């Protein structure tokens, strides 16, 4: 699982 939305840190959801 990843998220295309760029966030300060990724892959935390």
């Amino acid at each position, epitope marked *: 699982f*990843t998220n*295309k939305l*760029k966030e300060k*840190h*990724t*892959d*935390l959801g």
Partner: antibody
Framework: EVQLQQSGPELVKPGASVKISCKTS????????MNWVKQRPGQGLEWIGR????????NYNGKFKDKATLTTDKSSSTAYMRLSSLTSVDSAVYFC???????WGQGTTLTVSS | DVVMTQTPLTLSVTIGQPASISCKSS???????????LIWLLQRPGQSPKRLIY???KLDSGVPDRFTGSGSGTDFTLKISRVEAEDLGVYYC?????????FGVGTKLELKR
């Protein structure tokens, strides 16, 4: 599974440059930050900087700003770090590490020596 | 930079016994977005670090239930309810709230027998 596969060990002369690679698989490369980390006995673990492959955004540690350049090749899902003007203090193990340091490469040993 | 001060530096413990490591940051790790970007890593010898705990208290996949994390602000703790033989290595706290991201010096966990 997420895999980070780094290039092999390097011996380089003082003053030279080297480029280390981190080939990824198992996730959409464009959607995760990629960090680079230095490990040297003595200095501990040090964060060099990171790059967001989706748009090439980079953040550098000021300590490494004049030393390191981070790039990505989206076509091969590979991240690269070039280190220049090498001196003996740059001898270390370098790791790539994804996102909030959740997956790590196996490390690349760099020795700077004549 | 944010300094990450871990204690103790060495942890000598007998199998089946509880243990804990604390981490102090020189600035609060509470981010403006409400998250606290504090993680714990374990590195065995000649191996790469592996993340165990993230966002202070969340366990990564496959990490045994014996591991817990707690804390807020500048002060954090990694707790092991019972140390097993395979827990040995160097534990690091690491913060990703402030640039540059920084690591603690590491705590070596060694086992008595």
């Amino acid at each position: 599974e997420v895999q980070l596969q780094q290039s092999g060990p390097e011996l380089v002369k003082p003053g030279a440059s080297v480029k280390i690679s981190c080939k990824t698989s198992g996730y959409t490369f464009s959607n995760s930050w990629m960090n680079w980390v230095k490990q040297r006995p003595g200095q501990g673990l040090e964060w060099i900087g990171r790059i967001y492959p989706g748009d090439g955004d980079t953040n550098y540690n000021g300590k490494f700003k004049d030393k390191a350049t981070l790039t990505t090749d989206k076509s091969s899902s590979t991240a690269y770090m070039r280190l220049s003007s090498l001196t003996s203090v740059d001898s270390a193990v370098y790791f790539c590490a994804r996102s909030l340091f959740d997956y790590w490469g196996q490390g690349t040993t760099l020795t700077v020596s004549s | 930079d944010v300094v990450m001060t871990q204690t103790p530096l060495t942890l000598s413990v007998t199998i089946g016994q509880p243990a804990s490591i604390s981490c102090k940051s020189s600035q609060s790790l509470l981010d403006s977005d409400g998250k606290t970007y504090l993680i714990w890593l374990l590195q065995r010898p000649g191996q790469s670090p592996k993340r165990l705990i993230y966002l202070v208290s969340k366990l990564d996949s496959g990490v045994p239930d014996r591991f817990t994390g707690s804390g807020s602000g500048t002060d954090f703790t990694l707790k092991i309810s019972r140390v097993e033989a395979e827990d040995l290595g160097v534990y690091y706290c690491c913060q990703g709230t402030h640039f540059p991201f920084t690591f603690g010096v590491g705590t070596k966990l060694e086992l008595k027998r």
